[PDB]
Amino acid sequence: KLHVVTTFYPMYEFTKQIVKDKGDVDLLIPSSVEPHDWEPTPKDIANIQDADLFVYNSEYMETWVPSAEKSMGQGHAVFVNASKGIDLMEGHAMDPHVWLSPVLAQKEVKNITAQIVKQDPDNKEYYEKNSKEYIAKLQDLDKLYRTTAKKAEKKEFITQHTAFGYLAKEYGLKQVPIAGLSPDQEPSAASLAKLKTYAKEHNVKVIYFEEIASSKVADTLASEIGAKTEVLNTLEGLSKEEQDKGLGYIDIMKQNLDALKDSLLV
Ligand SMILES: [Mn+2]
Q: Determine the distance separating the centroid of ligand 1 and the alpha carbon of 161, expressed in angstroms.
A: 9
Pairing mode of beta strands 174-177, 156-159? parallel
The dihedral through the CA atoms of 60, 65, 71, 74 has a sign that is: negative
Angle at 241 between CA 240 and CA 245, to 5 degrees: 120
Assign 68 to helix, strand or coil: helix
DSSP letter at 85? T
Q: In CATH terms, are 1-152 and 153-266 the same topology?
A: yes
Whether residue 217 contacts residue 184, with contact meaning beta carbons closer than 8 Å, is answered with yes
The environment of the single-atom ion ligand 1, i.e. residues with CB closer than 5 A, is 163
CA atoms within 13 A on the CB side of 185: 5
Name residue 132's amino acid: K
Name the CATH superfamily for 153-266: Nitrogenase molybdenum iron protein domain (3.40.50.1980)
- Please indicate if the annotation marks 36 as binding a ligand: yes
- Please indicate if the annotation marks 92 as binding a ligand: no
- Calpha distance 43→26 (Å, rounded): 14
- Calpha distance 74→199 (Å, rounded): 54
Q: Would you tell me how many other CB atoms lie within 10 Å of the CB of residue 69? A: 19
- Please indicate if the annotation marks 161 as binding a ligand: yes
Phi-psi region of 246 (alpha: psi -120 to 50; beta: other; left: phi over 0): left
Greatest distance between any 2 Cα atoms in the chain: 63
Beginning with the edge strand found earlier in the chain, give each strand of the sheet holding 174-177 in spatial order. Answer: 174-177, 156-159, 206-208, 228-230
Class of domain 1-152: alpha beta
Q: Determine the distance separating the centroid of ligand 1 and the alpha carbon of 91, expressed in angstroms.
A: 11
- Please indicate if the annotation marks 224 as binding a ligand: no
The method recorded for this entry reads X-ray
Angle at 254 between CA 16 and CA 156, to 5 degrees: 125
CA dist 83 → 80, 89, 102 (Å): 9, 11, 13
Report domain extents, the chain: 1-152, 153-266
CA atoms within 13 A on the CB side of 232: 27
Q: Determine the distance separating the centroid of ligand 1 and the alpha carbon of 236, expressed in angstroms.
A: 7
Whether residue 47 contacts residue 3, with contact meaning beta carbons closer than 8 Å, is answered with no
